[PDB]
Short mmCIF file of C-alpha atoms in Angstrom, two decimals:
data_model
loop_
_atom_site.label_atom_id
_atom_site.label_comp_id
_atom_site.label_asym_id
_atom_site.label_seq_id
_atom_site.Cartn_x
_atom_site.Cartn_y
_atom_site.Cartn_z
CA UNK A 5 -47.71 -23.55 37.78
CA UNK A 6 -47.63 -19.76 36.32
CA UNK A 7 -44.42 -18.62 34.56
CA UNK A 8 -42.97 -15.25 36.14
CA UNK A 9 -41.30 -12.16 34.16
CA UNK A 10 -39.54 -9.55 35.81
CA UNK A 11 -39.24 -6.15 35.33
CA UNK A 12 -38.15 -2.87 36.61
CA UNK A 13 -40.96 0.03 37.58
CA UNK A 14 -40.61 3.35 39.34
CA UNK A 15 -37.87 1.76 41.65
CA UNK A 16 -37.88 -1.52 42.22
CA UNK A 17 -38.32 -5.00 40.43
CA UNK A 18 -41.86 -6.22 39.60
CA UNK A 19 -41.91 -9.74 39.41
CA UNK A 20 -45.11 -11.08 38.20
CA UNK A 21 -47.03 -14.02 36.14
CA UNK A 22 -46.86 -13.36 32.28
CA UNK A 23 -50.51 -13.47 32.31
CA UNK A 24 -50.07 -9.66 33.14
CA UNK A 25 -49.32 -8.24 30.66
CA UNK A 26 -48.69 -3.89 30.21
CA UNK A 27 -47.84 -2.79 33.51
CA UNK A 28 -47.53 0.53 34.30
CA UNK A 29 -47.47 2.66 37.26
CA UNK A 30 -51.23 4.66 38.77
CA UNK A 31 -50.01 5.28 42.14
CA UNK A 32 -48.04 4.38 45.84
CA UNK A 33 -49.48 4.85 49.19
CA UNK A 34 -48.24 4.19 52.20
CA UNK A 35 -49.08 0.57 52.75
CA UNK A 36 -47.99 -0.67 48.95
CA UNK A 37 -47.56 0.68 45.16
CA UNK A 38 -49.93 0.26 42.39
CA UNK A 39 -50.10 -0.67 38.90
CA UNK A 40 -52.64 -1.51 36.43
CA UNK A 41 -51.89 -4.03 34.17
CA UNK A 42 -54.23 -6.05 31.32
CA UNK A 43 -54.59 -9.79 32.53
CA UNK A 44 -54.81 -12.19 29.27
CA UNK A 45 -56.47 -15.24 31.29
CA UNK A 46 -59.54 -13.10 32.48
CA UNK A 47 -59.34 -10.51 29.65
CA UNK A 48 -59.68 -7.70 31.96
CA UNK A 49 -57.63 -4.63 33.20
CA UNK A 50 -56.49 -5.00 36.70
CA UNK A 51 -54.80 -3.51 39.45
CA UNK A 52 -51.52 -5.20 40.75
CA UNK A 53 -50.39 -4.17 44.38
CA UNK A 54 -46.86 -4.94 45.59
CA UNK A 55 -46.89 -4.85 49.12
CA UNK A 56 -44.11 -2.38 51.14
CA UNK A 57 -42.08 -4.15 53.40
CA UNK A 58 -44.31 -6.88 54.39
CA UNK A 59 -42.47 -8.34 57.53
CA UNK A 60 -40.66 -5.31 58.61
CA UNK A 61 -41.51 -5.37 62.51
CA UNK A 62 -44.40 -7.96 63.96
CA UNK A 63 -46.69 -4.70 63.72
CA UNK A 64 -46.69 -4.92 60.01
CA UNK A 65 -46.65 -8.88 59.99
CA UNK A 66 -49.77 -8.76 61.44
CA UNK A 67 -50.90 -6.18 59.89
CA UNK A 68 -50.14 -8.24 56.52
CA UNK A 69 -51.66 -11.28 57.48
CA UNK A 70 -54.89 -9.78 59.41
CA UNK A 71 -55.34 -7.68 55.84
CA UNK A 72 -55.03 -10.80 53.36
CA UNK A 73 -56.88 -13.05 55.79
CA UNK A 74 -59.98 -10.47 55.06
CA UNK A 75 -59.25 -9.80 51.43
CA UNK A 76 -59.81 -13.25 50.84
CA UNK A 77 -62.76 -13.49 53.33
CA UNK A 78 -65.00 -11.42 51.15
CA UNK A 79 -67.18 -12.65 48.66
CA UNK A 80 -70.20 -9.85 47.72
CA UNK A 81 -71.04 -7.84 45.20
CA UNK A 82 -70.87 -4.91 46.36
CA UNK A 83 -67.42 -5.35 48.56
CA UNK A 84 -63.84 -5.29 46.89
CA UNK A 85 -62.96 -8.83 46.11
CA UNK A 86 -59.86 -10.56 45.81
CA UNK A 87 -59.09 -11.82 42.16
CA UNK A 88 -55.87 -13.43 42.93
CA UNK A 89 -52.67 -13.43 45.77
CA UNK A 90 -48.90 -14.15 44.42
CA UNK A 91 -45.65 -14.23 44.93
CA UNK A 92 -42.56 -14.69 43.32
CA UNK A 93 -40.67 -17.21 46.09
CA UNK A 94 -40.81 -20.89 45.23
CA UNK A 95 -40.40 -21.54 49.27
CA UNK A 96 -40.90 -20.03 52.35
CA UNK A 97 -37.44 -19.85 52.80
CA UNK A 98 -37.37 -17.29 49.85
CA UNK A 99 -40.43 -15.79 50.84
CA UNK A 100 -40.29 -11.82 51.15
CA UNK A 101 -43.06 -10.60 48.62
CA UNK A 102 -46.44 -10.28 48.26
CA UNK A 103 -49.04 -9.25 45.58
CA UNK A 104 -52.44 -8.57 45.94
CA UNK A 105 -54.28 -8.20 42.63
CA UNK A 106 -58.13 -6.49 42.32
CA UNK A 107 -60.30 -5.15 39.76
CA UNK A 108 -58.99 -1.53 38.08
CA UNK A 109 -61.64 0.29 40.47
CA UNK A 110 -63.22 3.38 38.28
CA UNK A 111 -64.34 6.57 40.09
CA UNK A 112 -65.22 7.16 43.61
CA UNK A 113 -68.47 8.33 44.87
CA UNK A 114 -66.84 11.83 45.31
CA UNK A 115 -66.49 12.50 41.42
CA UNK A 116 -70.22 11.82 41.05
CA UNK A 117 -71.09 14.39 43.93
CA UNK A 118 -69.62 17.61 42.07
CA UNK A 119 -71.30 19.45 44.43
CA UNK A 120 -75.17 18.82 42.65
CA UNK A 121 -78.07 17.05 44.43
CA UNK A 122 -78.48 13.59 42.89
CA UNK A 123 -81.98 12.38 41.97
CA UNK A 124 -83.97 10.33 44.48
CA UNK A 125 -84.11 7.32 42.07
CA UNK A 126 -80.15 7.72 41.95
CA UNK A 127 -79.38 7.96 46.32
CA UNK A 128 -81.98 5.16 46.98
CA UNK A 129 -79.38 2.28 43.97
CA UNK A 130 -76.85 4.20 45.68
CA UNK A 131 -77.22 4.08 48.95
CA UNK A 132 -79.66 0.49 49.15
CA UNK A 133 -75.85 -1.13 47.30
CA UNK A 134 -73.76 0.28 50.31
CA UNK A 135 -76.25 -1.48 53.57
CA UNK A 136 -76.41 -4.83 51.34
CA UNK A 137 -72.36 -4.31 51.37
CA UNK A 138 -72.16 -3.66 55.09
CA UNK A 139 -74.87 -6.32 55.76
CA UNK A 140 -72.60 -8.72 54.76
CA UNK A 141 -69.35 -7.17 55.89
CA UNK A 142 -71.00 -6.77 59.65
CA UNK A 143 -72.40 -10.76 59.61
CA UNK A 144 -68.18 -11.42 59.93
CA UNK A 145 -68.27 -9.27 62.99
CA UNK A 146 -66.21 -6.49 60.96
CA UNK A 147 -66.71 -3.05 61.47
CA UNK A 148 -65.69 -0.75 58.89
CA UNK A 149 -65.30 3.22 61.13
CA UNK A 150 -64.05 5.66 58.74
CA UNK A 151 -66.07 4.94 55.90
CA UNK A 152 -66.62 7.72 53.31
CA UNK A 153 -67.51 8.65 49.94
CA UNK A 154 -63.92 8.11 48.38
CA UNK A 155 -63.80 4.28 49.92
CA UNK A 156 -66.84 3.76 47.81
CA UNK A 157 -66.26 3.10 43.94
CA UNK A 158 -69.34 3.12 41.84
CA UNK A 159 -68.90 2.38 37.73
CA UNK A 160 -70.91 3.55 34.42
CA UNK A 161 -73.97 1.39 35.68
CA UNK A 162 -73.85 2.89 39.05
CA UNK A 163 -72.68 -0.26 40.62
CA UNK A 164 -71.28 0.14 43.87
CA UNK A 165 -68.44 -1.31 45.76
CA UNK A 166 -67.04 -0.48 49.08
CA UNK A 167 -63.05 -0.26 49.00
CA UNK A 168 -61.53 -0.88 52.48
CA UNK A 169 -62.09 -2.21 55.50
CA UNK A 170 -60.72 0.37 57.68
CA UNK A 171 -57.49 -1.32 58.60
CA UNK A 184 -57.93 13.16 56.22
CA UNK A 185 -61.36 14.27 57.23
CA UNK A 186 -63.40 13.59 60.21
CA UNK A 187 -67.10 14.96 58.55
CA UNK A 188 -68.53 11.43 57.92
CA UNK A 189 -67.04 10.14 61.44
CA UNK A 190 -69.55 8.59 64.63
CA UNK A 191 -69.26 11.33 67.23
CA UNK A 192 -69.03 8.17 70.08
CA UNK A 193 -65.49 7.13 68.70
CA UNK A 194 -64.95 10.87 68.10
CA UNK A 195 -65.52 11.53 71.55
CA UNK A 196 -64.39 7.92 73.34
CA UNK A 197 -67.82 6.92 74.74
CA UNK A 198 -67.19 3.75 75.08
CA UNK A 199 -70.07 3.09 73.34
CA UNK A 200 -71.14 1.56 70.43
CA UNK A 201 -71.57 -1.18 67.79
CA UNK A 202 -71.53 -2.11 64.19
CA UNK A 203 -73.93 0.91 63.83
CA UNK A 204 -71.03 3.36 64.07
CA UNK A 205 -70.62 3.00 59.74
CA UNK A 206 -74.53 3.78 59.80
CA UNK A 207 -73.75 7.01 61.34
CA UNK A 208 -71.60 7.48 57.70
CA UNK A 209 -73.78 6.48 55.54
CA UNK A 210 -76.19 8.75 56.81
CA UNK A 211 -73.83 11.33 56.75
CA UNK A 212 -73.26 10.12 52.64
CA UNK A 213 -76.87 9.58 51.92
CA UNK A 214 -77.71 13.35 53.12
CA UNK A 215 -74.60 14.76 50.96
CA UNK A 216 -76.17 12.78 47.63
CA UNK A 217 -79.79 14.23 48.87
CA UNK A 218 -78.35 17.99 48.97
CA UNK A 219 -75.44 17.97 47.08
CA UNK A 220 -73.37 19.62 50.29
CA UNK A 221 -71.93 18.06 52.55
CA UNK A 222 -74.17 17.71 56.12
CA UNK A 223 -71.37 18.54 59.19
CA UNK A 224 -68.47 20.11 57.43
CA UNK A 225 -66.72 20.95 60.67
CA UNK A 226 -63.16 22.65 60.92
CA UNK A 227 -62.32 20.64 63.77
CA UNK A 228 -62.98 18.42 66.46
CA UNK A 229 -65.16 20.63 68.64
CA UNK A 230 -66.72 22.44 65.31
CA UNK A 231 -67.94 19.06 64.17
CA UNK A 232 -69.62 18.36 67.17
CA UNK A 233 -71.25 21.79 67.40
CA UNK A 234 -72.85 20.94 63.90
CA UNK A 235 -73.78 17.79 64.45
CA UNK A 236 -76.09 18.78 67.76
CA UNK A 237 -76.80 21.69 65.95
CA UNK A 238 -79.45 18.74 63.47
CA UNK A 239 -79.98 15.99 65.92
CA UNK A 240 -80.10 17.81 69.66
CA UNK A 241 -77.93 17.31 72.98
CA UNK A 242 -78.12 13.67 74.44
CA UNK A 243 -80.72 13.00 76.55
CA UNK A 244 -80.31 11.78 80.22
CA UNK A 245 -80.85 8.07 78.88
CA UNK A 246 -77.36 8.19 76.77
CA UNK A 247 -75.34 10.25 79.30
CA UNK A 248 -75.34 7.25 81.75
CA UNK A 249 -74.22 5.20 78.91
CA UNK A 250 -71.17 6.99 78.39
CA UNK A 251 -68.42 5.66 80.82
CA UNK A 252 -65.65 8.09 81.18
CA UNK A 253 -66.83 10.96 83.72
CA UNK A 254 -64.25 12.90 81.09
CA UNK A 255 -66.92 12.67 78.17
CA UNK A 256 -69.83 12.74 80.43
CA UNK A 257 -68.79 16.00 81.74
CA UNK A 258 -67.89 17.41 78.39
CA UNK A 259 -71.33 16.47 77.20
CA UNK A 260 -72.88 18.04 80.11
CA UNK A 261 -70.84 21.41 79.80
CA UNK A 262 -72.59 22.41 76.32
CA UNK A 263 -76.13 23.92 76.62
CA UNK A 264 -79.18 22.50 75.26
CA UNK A 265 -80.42 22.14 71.77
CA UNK A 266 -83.13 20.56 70.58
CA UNK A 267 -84.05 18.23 67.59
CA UNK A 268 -84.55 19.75 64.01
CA UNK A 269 -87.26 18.57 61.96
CA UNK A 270 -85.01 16.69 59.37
CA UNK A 271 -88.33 17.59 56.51
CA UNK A 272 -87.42 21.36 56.76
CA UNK A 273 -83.13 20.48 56.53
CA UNK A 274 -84.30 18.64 53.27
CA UNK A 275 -86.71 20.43 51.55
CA UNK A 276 -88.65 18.84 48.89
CA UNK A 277 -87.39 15.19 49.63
CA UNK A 278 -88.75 12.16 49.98
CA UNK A 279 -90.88 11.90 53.08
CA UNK A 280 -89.39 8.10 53.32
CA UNK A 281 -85.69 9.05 52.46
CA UNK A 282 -86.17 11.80 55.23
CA UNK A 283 -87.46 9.07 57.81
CA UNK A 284 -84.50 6.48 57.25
CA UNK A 285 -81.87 10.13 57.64
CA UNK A 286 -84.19 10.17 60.97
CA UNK A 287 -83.01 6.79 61.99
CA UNK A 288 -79.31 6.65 60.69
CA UNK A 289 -78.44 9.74 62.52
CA UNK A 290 -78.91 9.53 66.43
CA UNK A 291 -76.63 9.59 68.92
CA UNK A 292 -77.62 6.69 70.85
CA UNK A 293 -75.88 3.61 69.39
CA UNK A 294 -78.78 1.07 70.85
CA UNK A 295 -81.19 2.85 69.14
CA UNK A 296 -79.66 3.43 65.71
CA UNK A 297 -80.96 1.17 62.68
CA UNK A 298 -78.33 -1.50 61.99
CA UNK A 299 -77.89 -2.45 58.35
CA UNK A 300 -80.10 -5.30 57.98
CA UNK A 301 -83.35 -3.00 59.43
CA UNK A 302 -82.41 -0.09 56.80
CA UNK A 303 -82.68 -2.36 54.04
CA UNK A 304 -86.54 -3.38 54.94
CA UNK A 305 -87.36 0.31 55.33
CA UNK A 306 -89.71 1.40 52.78
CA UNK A 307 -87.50 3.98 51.13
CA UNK A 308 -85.72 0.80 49.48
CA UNK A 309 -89.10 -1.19 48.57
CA UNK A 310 -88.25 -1.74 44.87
CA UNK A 311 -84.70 -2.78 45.20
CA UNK A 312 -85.30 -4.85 48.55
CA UNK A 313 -84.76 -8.76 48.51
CA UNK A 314 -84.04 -10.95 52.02
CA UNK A 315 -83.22 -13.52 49.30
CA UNK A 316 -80.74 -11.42 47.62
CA UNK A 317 -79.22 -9.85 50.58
CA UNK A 318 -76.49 -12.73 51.76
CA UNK A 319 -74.60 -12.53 55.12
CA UNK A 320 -70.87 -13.65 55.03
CA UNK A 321 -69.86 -17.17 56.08
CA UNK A 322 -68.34 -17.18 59.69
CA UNK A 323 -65.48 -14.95 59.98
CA UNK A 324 -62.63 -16.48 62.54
CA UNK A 325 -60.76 -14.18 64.29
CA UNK A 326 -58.74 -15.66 67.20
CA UNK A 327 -55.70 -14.97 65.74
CA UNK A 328 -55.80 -11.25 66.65
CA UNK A 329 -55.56 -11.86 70.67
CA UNK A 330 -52.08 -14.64 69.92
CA UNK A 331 -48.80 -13.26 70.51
CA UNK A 332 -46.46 -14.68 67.66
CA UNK A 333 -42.72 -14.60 66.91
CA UNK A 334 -42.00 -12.74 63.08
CA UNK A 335 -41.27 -15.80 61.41
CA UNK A 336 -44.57 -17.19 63.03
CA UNK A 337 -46.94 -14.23 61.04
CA UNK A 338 -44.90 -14.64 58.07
CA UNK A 339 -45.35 -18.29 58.02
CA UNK A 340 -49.22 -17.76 58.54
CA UNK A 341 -49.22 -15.35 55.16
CA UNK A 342 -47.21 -17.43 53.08
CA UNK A 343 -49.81 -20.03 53.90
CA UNK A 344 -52.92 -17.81 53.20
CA UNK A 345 -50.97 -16.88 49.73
CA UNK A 346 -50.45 -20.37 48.56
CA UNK A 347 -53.43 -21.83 49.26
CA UNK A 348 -55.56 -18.86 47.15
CA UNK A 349 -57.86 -20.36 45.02
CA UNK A 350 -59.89 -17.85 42.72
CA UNK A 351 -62.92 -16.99 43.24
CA UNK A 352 -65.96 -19.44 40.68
CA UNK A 353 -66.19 -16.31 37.88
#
């Protein structure tokens, strides 16, 4: 249906439907290259992604397809959204590009941390928008594992979105898939967020190792050595042994590492930030704590629809993942705005 103009940016041809209008170049990383453009339909700017060699090797195939399949799966406010899919090829037989358009995404969390302690009021909107994002994301049996304060774009209103899915820095990691326990669970980005939420509270940031066995020194440095109860957890006699090789520390009180805060905001920190993966609060339980009791709403607090993922364990000839993309593209319909 949509007419297509092409042009040439940085290197290469752009070719794109004339409802985007003013291209021009923000950025490339390693996956695709970016530019925002103004789209007359919607009346808003956007960002236009061209993706890099789609269907170079069955890796990236896959990698295409398993990335679109979620882009399109996720429907919340507070988790990038799809606003439209396109290419240029009028078959499949011409098929080589893909386009991936989203919202021009304003700041990340990081610019609003310059280093200053946020007020209360501020970390509970921020913080409350990022569990009702993961909420939903975890309900499709996604988890997330390197989230941190630069995947999380928040606008003049304080809105907050969360920007990938986890398809640098290792301070706002889960020491269990630091270490390979073996063990854990959608919980893992709760381990960030407390790690975030703490950062906001303070204005520093909580474990700023300078390595792998720096960052774990911190980190039992707050919470304490693992207790006999989590060491038989752990599988690997590896990890178990380097668990049991560093001496004992206890517990801090978290009220004395965060002076003057809120006694509830210190009690959820308490609960984000334990070792033990069975025992840390999940998304949905952080969101009835009482830290959250103006903002929180079971009604307003939707879980995705199911999220099928049998595709990932299929072994598929190139043509096969590039057949299952081209169908995903077609078939977009936008989202009801």
């Amino acid at each position: 249906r949509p007419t297509f103009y092409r042009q040439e940016l940085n290197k290469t041809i752009w070719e794109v439907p004339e409802r985007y209008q003013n291209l021009s170049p923000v950025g490339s990383g390693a996956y695709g290259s970016v530019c925002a453009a103004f789209d007359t339909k919607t009346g808003h700017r956007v960002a236009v992604k061209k993706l890099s060699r789609p269907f170079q090797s069955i890796i990236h195939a896959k990698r295409t397809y398993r990335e679109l399949r979620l882009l399109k799966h996720m429907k919340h406010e507070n988790v990038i959204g799809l606003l439209d899919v396109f290419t240029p090829a009028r078959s499949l037989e011409e098929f080589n590009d893909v386009y991936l358009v989203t919202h021009l995404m304003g700041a990340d969390l990081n610019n609003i941390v310059k280093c200053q302690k946020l007020t209360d009021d501020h970390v509970q909107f921020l913080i409350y928008q990022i569990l009702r994002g993961l909420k939903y994301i975890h309900s499709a049996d996604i988890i997330h594992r390197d989230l941190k304060p630069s995947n999380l774009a928040v606008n003049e209103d304080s809105e907050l979105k969360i920007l990938d899915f986890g398809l640098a820095t290792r301070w706002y990691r889960a020491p269990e898939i630091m270490l390979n326990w073996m063990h854990y669970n959608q919980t893992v980005d709760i381990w960030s967020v407390g790690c975030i939420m703490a950062e906001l509270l303070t204005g520093r940031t909580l474990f700023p190792g300078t390595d792998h066995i720096d960052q774990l020194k911190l980190i039992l440095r707050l919470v304490g050595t693992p207790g006999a109860e989590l060491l038989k957890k752990i599988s690997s006699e590896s990890a178990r042994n380097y668990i049991q090789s560093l001496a004992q520390m206890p517990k801090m009180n978290f009220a004395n590492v965060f002076i003057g805060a809120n006694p509830l905001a210190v009690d959820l920190l308490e609960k984000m930030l334990v070792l033990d993966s069975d025992k840390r609060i999940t998304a949905a339980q952080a969101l009835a704590h009482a830290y959250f009791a103006q903002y929180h709403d079971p009604d307003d607090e939707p879980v995705a629809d199911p999220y099928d993922q049998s595709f990932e364990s299929r072994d598929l000839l190139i043509d096969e993942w590039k057949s299952l993309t081209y169908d995903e593209v077609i078939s977009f319909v936008p989202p009801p705005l």
